[PDB]
Each structure stands twice: as structure tokens, then as C-alpha cells.
Amino acid sequence: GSHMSAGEPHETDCSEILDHLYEFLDKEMPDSDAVKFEHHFEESSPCLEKYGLEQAVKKLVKRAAGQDDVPGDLRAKVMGRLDLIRSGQSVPEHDVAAAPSSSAPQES
Numbered sequence: 001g002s003h004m005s006a007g008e009p010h011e012t013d014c015s016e017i018l019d020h021l022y023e024f025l026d027k028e029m030p031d032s033d034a035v036k037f038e039h040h041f042e043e044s045s046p047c048l049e050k051y052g053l054e055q056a057v058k059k060l061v062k063r064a065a066g067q068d069d070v071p072g073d074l075r076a077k078v079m080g081r082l083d084l085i086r087s088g089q090s091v092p093e094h095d096v097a098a099a100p101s102s103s104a105p106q107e108s
């Protein structure tokens with residue numbers, strides 16, 4: 001579609017921006033870039049619930065300067081509720097049909 005781009009938002013697919021919300025939390029950088037997360041409350045698809053977006057989207061709103069300060073401890077554990085998807089071990093576990101894990105990690 002488009003060849004040249006100056007600075008457009010990532011709304012084509014929530015995943016990309018949604019992954020941006022987590023990747024951001026990983027390194028925990030200033031609330032500068034973060035500010036492009038507030039725009040996600042406007043348009044996106046729109047993305048539906050029942051997946052785990054409140055976590056990454058509520059954080060951005062709760063932050064917005066002021067909260068940048070050093071966190072306590074639970075905060076650090078909040079990032080793990082999104083981390084569960086990165087592995088998808090418990091995601092399937094529900095009924096007696098699908099397996100807890102589909103693909104296993106390789107290591108030598």
C-alpha cells in the first residue's frame with residue numbers, strides 16, 4: 001500500500017502496539033514514548049475484550065508522569081500476568097481437549 005512514511009501510529013494490528021506496551025514495560029523507559037499509548041484509547045480496530053489488554057492499557061493511563069518514580073514490588077509482578085502469554089502454558093489449559101503447551105523450546 002504505502003511505500004514512504006513519516007510518522008504514522010501502529011493501529012493496523014493491536015498486537016504490534018500491544019507488544020509495544022509490554023516491551024516498553026520491560027526496559028521501563030521514561031514516560032516520553034509512553035505518551036503514544038494514550039492514543040490507543042481512541043482507535044485500534046477496535047480491539048475487543050477477553051484477552052488481557054486492561055493490564056497494559058491501564059498502566060499507561062495510571063502513569064502519565066508522577067508515577068515514574070521507583071515502584072514498590074507488586075508492580076514488578078504485574079508485568080508477569082502479561083508474561084504468561086509469552087509462553088502460553090496456562091492460556092490453553094481449560095478443558096479436556098487442548099494441551100497446556102503446543103511447541104517446546106529448543107536448547108543444546
Ligand SMILES: [Zn+2]
Binds near residue numbers: 014040043047
Ligand atoms: Zn487495541
